[PDB]
Design a protein around this ligand. Sequence first.
Ligand SMILES: [Mg+2]
Ligand SMILES: [Mg+2]
Ligand SMILES: [Mg+2]
Ligand SMILES: [Mg+2]
Ligand SMILES: [Mg+2]
Ligand SMILES: [Mg+2]
Ligand SMILES: [Mg+2]
Ligand SMILES: [Mg+2]
Ligand SMILES: [Mg+2]
Ligand SMILES: [Mg+2]
Ligand SMILES: [Mg+2]
Ligand SMILES: [Mg+2]
Ligand SMILES: [Mg+2]
Ligand SMILES: [Mg+2]
Lengths: 199, 134, 107, 190, 176
Amino acid sequence: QVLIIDGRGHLLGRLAAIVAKQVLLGRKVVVVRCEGINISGNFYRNKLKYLAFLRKRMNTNPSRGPYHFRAPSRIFWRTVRGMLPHKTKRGQAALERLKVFDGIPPPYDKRKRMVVPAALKIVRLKPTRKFAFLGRLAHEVGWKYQAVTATLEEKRKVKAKLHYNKKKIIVKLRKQAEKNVESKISKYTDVLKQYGILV
Amino acid sequence: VFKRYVQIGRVAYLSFGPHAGKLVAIVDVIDQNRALVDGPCTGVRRQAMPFKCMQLTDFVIKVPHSARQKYVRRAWEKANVNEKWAESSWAKKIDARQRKAKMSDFDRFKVMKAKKMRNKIIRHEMKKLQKEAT
Amino acid sequence: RLWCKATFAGYKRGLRNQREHTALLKIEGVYARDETEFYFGKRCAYVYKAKNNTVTPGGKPNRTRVIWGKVTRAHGNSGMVRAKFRSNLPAKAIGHRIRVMLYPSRI
Amino acid sequence: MKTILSNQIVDIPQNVDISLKGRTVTVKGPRGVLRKNFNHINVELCLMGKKKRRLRVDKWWGNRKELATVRTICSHVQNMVKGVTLGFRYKMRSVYAHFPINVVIQESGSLVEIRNFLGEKYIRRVRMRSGVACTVSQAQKDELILEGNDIELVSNSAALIQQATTVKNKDIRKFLDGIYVSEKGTVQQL
Amino acid sequence: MKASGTLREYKVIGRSLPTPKAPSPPLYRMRIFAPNHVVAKSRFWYFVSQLKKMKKASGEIVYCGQVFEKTPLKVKNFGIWLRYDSRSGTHNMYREYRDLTTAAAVTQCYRDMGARHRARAHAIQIMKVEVIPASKCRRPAIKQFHDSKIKFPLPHRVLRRQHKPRFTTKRPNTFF
RNA sequence: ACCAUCUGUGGGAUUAUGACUGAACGCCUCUAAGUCAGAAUCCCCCCUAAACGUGACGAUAAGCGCCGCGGAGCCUCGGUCGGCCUCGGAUAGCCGGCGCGCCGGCGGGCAGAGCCGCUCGCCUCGGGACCGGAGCGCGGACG
RNA sequence: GACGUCGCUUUUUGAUCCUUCGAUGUCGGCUCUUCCUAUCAUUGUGAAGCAGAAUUCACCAAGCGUUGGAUUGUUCACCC
RNA sequence: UGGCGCUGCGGGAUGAACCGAACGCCGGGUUAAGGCGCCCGAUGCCGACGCUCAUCAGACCCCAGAAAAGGUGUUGGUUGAUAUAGACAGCGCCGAAUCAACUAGCCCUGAAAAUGGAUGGCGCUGGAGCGUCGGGCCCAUACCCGGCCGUCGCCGGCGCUGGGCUAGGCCGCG
RNA sequence: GCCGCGCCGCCGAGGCGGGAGGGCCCGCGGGAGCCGCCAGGGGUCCGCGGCGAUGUCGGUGUCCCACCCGACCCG
RNA sequence: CCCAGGGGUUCAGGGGAGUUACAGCCCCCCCCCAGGCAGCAUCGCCGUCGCCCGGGGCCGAGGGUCCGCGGCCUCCUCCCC
Ligand SMILES: [Mg+2]
Ligand SMILES: [Mg+2]
Ligand SMILES: [Mg+2]
Ligand SMILES: [Mg+2]
Ligand SMILES: [Mg+2]
Ligand SMILES: [Mg+2]
Ligand SMILES: [Mg+2]
Ligand SMILES: [Mg+2]
Ligand SMILES: [Mg+2]
Ligand SMILES: [Mg+2]
Ligand SMILES: [Mg+2]
Ligand SMILES: [Mg+2]
Ligand SMILES: [Mg+2]
Ligand SMILES: [Mg+2]
């Protein structure tokens, strides 16, 4: 019911153009690891694009002007909002279906995350072109939580790898059981191989 | 790091296009994008074809440069391309994928019943070895 | 379940005009125009719940109401379809579920 | 215009044992080991032959900007070869007119304290890169010796010392004082 | 001309209207490359009108037929001598192409003259096209394929079908 | 009341620029790939404010809080129409198994193009199984 | 940088008369905030007909500062 | 000469004049100009070929900022000149091509103004950029077919009656 | 270039007359006649189902509210 | 089936060891346009709605014959009962 997407390796606008279309169709999308989102062009380009964004403020009262969020999740959230009619009740309901997170929080750490091939860097960008990470771009504009997120993501990959190694033993046990009971499932494996289920 | 190359005689699999699913022999390379393929034993006559719809296979037949279809057919039959392809896992996964798409409602019920008992028998064997190992 | 999942993506519109007498549905599995032919003519239903109870055919009254429609033609190249309902779909249904029935069947 | 194939072969001596893990080249010689990743060049590397090993750097369908990175791969590995067999010996020379440049090496060649440059009281503490050892040269008055296996680390450690002795607000054509690189050689001379 | 789609080699033969003062005017044949014959006739009355004192009204076209490829199954090197008007002036050029059909190479030329020089179809005048052997080719991009036992892989194959699975758990591979 | 007195601050990426390695272009080259130093600028810390943002915790009045899937009912608001309980990532290579090797698999069948769940009930064959499964159940690890 | 020549700016003036004549208070000063850079000074550099000192040219650059007075209503000048 | 004024409609974000097309009230269909990453209907095509990296990239009538002059950025083309009686570059060695001028695309320099801001916005760099094209698709009060209303035109029809002919009525057609 | 003849080429551009047969055709020979059928002067069924007075059915355009789209103040 | 029977020539994206050899390519001749099968089926264009069949959507406005057929008007035979 919830489209959990991993933000690592994806482009900013390529992914936001698709996530904005899913929430308008009444679907709930959760984009994790927004610091891993890539942006085409060298880093100095995208950094200047954000520094020029920092200058856009109401001269008389900056507290009313454009709120410049520094977190990579809120940066990607503002990108998706730009492709939505957020000044209408239909567009505001679409924003309520999207939840962005820096890293992979516990509510989604134990989940299988989707990948959008139409937004990956390997598919949409040349191998020789320059790109930039949203985690470094945010760190150099005021994101104060890059070091704590990197350490928490570091421990998240340790417990995710211990689970994967246990999952590899279960697959080894499952493949071994298929050979030790092949005589009892011979009539069943012939049905699946007959209808193309197995090969 | 590369093992499959585009060369004279390289048997290629057409993923999409008008001849999707058939094997062709790259007899000549026109440009960086297109080639001159010809499948005499498959049903794809000599014609230009882009590389984006080709998928290189592990079969290379010995055909001369710009030889007509009579000699491209000999190397296709000398190397037994159709026999080696039909026994390769590439075609067997294609055959399995085609049969799964032609399954009727009664075929899915027979698969539902077969897979239901096949998993429960394997799942208990996994529990049997776990109890034995401890 | 005997119906296909569809989403009320919006009305038949241009950019500055909206024709509410025609709806654009998005079927969950149809992502190409060459796949919309199967659904041409299928019954559409916008099932929802209200406050007051209404009569139910073949059952007891409840809060469930429905607006029946039918897929008329395809729309674009991405598997979208057009549907006309006896009453124009309310704007609150945009992004909600539309049941695409398997009848009238042609298989 | 895109060239079909652009290759170049690198000769590898018998005392160097090279291992390829994708694009990460690892050379091991009598003077130590080196390891430099080339995953940003996007080329093909291959070791041909068991005896008299070679390194084949291939580039398929590359324009002029991408063909230029082919020899850069080869010239880098050749530096990694002579860095583990012969090494690199960059020699500095302290040039001064009136005030002699006092260089004292500390932390076992990992720190260079430059004193009495143009009579300045400020002390210039230049820390060498990892694996680079600096030493006051013998048989010479104001010569330094920078040794290491990686040319990019020894030549960079020489640029740190040289740019540290920079004259400000003066005619540099008249005030030619500083520690400059005089010779770029090897530790073993064959 | 718009050069829509793949052009066709038309052999348009025409002449002037026979007059009592000068009867039996000579027949003039041209090698027109137009997407259809209606454009091939209009293109004929563009070069003949500027080379000779002939007009569409005072002349007639006796034959406008499509020229088929005599060797469609063979890869041939073509040489196209053409003049085109830039934003500054007119320049003569000689291009080379590898294709199966003469019309498929002239079509490939319009796609190239407009790509590298921003030259539109109305500014290009194809003057001479002839099949050239591999020993008389000048361009390295064409002459690099003149090598038997040619071999090259397909490095970093871009994943097409990006939207057939739009959301998948497996990241695509580019090495095959 | 500088008309008395006290205090006023740390880093990060980098600009200009100077360089390293090194091609293109047998040489050369700060640049093409890759690196270094680098500033009254920029960002941030320090500092002021504290959001239709919020955490921990205390105390919680014949009333009131927990605990009997309370045990039955009356008004209301929305969806929705099987789950997936998870490596890290590479993309000019990857994955699996076995003590830097070897073996095996790659248009991904150890496959998200997938996996898993899925006879209308209630009793009877014993033909295959030892599926010993099922808890408004009682305890113990793991957050 | 002569003879030439190509631009830019809207802090001069002119040209125009589109908005306002059932009215947009109009010069300067004072006060006060913010902005621009076509940088005078300070920060980091490059160049010299840069020995030092002083100065000139150019670059990144508007963070910071650009004062006190005589005369004049004057902006503008001039002088201490 | 057309148009605006006297005129709405689709498109150009926007806007008296531009592009398309002019208007009774509706249904179905099809288009124009213009579009089809998301806002925003449509390419969620396994589109084709190239060009281009921009530390002020670029992004299409009117139209809403550029020039002269430059670049050993990159890609084309043109006209010449040296070279296996051994050139170019580097120290006779080296052993295969090389050099010069000119021209044309894109990018770059030239390129400085004042509240914070404008390919419309988000954003886009195996393209959502520029050029050349293909197939498909999107909708205007335009076009086609159908209903209804009114007007106008019929050398209109009916005084020859179940209904009918208040003929100032009724009916038919375009 | 015209005119005449001859030869030759012309799916069958073809037309006339006749001959051996084979077999494909005709709004020729069938209409002041009875019966039906119907791609024939604009739709019918000589088809059918569910629901039924205290909580339901239809309307409630013009009472309130919600959302999408359009939409700047008249003279 | 190099179609076979006589052969000639020719280069190179040069196979085998420079011109067919342990692959082939091209240009030409005299023998039944050798036969045999396909016919815009890698590449166009167009029909005397061109012949037939099917599917989806939209709606029935009006309300006192024409044009195609078939059976019988002629006797039987067969199938089906
Ligand atoms: Mg630099
Ligand atoms: Mg640095
Ligand atoms: Mg002058
Ligand atoms: Mg400036
Ligand atoms: Mg000085
Ligand atoms: Mg004063
Ligand atoms: Mg007027
Ligand atoms: Mg008028
Ligand atoms: Mg505009
Ligand atoms: Mg319409
Ligand atoms: Mg648009
Ligand atoms: Mg200049
Ligand atoms: Mg520019
Ligand atoms: Mg009509």
